């Protein structure tokens, strides 16, 4: 499948080369696989998402995303026209509220709540959970996000936005899920990504064209809008059956574009997610 005049994060991973516009796909296109966002919320209702959405669990007054920064991020994973995973069943965690605020505590029964919860999903593709937030290092916060993958979901974490070491952040530090950091159009590490040893992957966060509230959509730029890529990138190829929930990570990362960003400081890995998708 061909989609013209994608937005760059799709053409991006979908090519050998930055500077293209189409996104190409198996148009399985995560068919039967699952993403949590757990995030602001989603905007079920709007039309990108062609009833594939639902709200799942809060922790606050409403599930309605009041933000945006959630609806965004859900977008890039598998709205119809913005996102990777065209065809995959969204569900969304709110643990942020309207603010983009979420006390630790929240955040981690956010997670614990996903590990139980895919057992009352369909997902026979596998289950991924897209993470677009972070703090200071949490012994627990991380220990929270290896229980998820342990359970069997494709974890994928933010690397943060403080140009600084994710090693002090989390979840972002916790060795066994899959933290992303963002790159621009130009193949840069985008200038607020955080990097370090802690990083198993790179993916487009330099404005991003995603959904937005009040059925809208906007361009936003964040180590928050890499993340979904590479979550749906993981549920597009668990459908494809090229990897599982334990093994994604590292299969990405396997078959990432290899030595093609600029500004990446030593020590950090030069990998850029690719699907590897021969049209
Ligand atoms: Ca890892």
Known sequence: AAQTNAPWGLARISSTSPGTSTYYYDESAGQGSCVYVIDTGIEASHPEFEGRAQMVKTYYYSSRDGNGHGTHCAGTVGSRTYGVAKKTQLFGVKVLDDNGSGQYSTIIAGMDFVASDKNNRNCPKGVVASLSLGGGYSSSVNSAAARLQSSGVMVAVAAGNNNADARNYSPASEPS??????????????????????LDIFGPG??????????????????????????????????????????????????????????????????????????
């Open 206 to 279: 330099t404005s991003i064209l995603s959904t937005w509230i009040g059925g809208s959509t906007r361009s936003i730029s964040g180590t928050s809008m890499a993340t979904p890529h590479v979550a749906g990138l993981a549920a597009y190829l668990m459908t494809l059956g090229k990897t599982t929930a334990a093994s994604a990570c590292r299969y990405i990362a396997d078959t990432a574009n290899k030595g093609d960003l600029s500004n990446i400081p030593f020590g950090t890995v030069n990998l850029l997610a690719y699907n590897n998708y021969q049209a």
């Open 177 to 198: 899920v899959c933290t992303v950091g963002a790159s621009d159009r130009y193949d840069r590490r985008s200038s607020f990504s955080n990097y370090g040893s802690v």
